[PDB]
């Protein structure tokens, strides 16, 4: 399982799930809603899979977590156009994790 010492981590993932621009993000990307994704975007990734790998030791560091996180974000640019909706969210989102993990880097 986690390592206390990752607990930061927990609270950074948490607060973004709780963000006004998650929506998009907080579980894998859904063929049932968006088609042609994973033609495209080699390794989704999303913030439920991140709890569930950081809450069950799938992380050993904060690099880890952190290079998922940039990863969801990394991937909504790739797909998603600047101005959609979706690709507006992943901007706010990238500060938002930039902010909260420079008060620790
Ligand atoms: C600004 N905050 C939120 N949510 C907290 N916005 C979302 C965004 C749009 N929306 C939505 C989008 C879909 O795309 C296929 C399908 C769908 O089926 C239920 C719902 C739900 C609301
Ligand atoms: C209502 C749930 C929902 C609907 C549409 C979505 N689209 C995306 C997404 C993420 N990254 N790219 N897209 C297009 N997440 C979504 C979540």
């Given at each position: 399982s986690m390592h206390s010492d990752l607990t930061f981590c927990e609270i950074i993932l948490m607060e973004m799930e709780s963000h006004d621009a998650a929506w998009p993000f907080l579980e894998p990307v859904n063929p049932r809603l968006v088609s042609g994704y994973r033609r495209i975007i080699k390794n989704p990734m999303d913030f439920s899979t991140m709890?569930?790998?950081?809450?069950?030791?799938?992380?050993?560091?904060?690099?880890?977590?952190?290079?998922?996180?940039?990863?969801?974000?990394d991937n909504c640019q790739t797909f998603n156009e600047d101005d959609s909706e979706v690709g507006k969210a992943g901007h706010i989102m990238r500060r938002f994790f930039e902010s909260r993990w420079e008060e620790f880097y």
């Open positions: 709890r569930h790998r950081l809450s069950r030791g799938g992380y050993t560091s904060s690099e880890e977590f952190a290079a998922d996180a940039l990863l969801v974000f």
